[PDB]
Write a protein that binds this ligand. Structure first.
Ligand code: CL
Ligand code: CL
Ligand code: CL
Ligand code: CL
Ligand code: CL
Ligand code: CL
Ligand code: NA
Ligand code: NA
Length: 232
C-alpha cells in the first residue's frame, strides 16, 4: 500500500539544524508533489511548502522560506526537510503529505523538540473544543476571511485526526464524504462560511478536526477543534 514513513521524534538543541525524512513507498515517488505541514496546539496546521520529486522544483510559504529547505532523493524514494537555526518556536509536529484531496496521504509526523533547560486567507473554527454525549450532535463552524469558491465549487476540505493516528481527509470540496467515511458525517457551506455536522456521535469520532482552504496560495488551515465524548 502507499505509505509515507517518518521518524517519531527528534530531540535537538537551539541553534542547530535538523533533517527530517519522509520515506515513500507503494507509488511512483517522482510523479506526485509532496507537501510539508507544521502542527502546534495554538496555531493548528501551517503549510510549509511543497516539492515535485521528479525534478526537485519547490514552492515555499513566505513565512518559512528561510527556515525550511526541501529536497528529494529519487534513488531512495525519500523526501527531506531541513529546519535551520532551531528556536523554541520550531518545537512542533511536522507531517509530510499528498494534500490534493484525490490523492490524500499523510505521514504520521515527526515531533521536533527544541530543548534547552537554561492577505493570506484566515480560517477561524468555532468552537475550538467541545464535549458531546454519545448519540448527540456535534456542529463545528469554519469561516474564511475571503471566499474560497471558484466556478461554483468550494476549495475547502475538512481533515480528522483521531488520537495517536495521522490526519486524514474527511470531507472534500465542502460537502463530499471521502471514501470510507461514515454517513453520520456531513458538511455544508459556500463562499466564506462552512459547517461540519456529526450525528449521532460515536466514541470513534473523538478527534481533532481541521478545515483547510486551497483556493489561493498559500494553502491555510483552521486552528482545529478537539471533540471529546461527554461521559454520562
Ligand atoms: Cl520514482
Ligand atoms: Cl517559493
Ligand atoms: Cl469559539
Ligand atoms: Cl463561484
Ligand atoms: Cl454512520
Ligand atoms: Cl481557529
Ligand atoms: Na519508490
Ligand atoms: Na463562535
Amino acid at each position: 500500500q502507499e505509505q509515507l514513513q517518518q521518524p517519531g521524534t527528534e530531540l535537538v538543541k537551539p541553534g542547530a539544524s535538523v533533517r527530517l525524512s519522509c520515506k515513500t513507498s507503494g507509488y511512483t515517488f517522482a510523479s506526485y508533489t509532496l507537501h510539508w505541514v507544521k502542527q502546534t496546539p495554538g496555531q493548528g496546521l501551517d503549510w510549509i511548502g511543497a516539492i515535485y520529486p521528479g525534478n526537485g522544483d519547490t514552492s515555499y510559504n513566505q513565512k518559512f522560506k528561510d527556515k525550511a529547505t526541501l529536497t528529494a532523493d529519487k534513488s531512495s524514494s525519500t523526501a527531506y526537510m531541513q529546519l535551520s537555526n532551531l528556536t523554541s518556536e520550531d518545537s512542533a509536529v511536522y507531517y509530510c503529505a499528498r494534500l490534493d484531496w484525490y490523492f490524500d496521504l499523510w505521514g504520521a509526523g515527526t515531533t521536533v523538540t527544541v530543548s534547552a533547560a537554561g492577505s493570506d486567507i484566515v480560517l477561524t473554527q468555532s468552537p475550538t473544543s467541545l464535549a458531546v454525549s454519545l448519540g448527540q450532535r456535534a456542529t463545528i463552524s469554519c469561516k474564511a476571511s475571503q471566499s474560497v469558491d471558484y466556478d461554483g465549487d468550494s476549495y475547502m476540505n475538512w481533515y480528522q485526526q483521531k488520537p495517536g493516528q495521522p490526519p486524514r481527509l474527511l470531507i472534500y470540496a465542502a460537502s463530499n464524504l471521502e471514501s470510507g467515511i461514515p454517513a453520520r458525517f456531513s458538511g455544508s457551506g459556500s463562499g466564506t462560511d462552512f459547517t461540519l455536522n456529526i450525528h449521532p456521535v460515536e466514541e470513534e469520532d473523538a478527534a481533532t478536526y481541521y478545515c483547510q482552504q486551497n483556493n489561493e496560495d498559500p494553502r491555510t488551515f483552521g486552528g482545529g477543534t478537539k471533540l471529546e465524548i461527554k461521559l454520562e
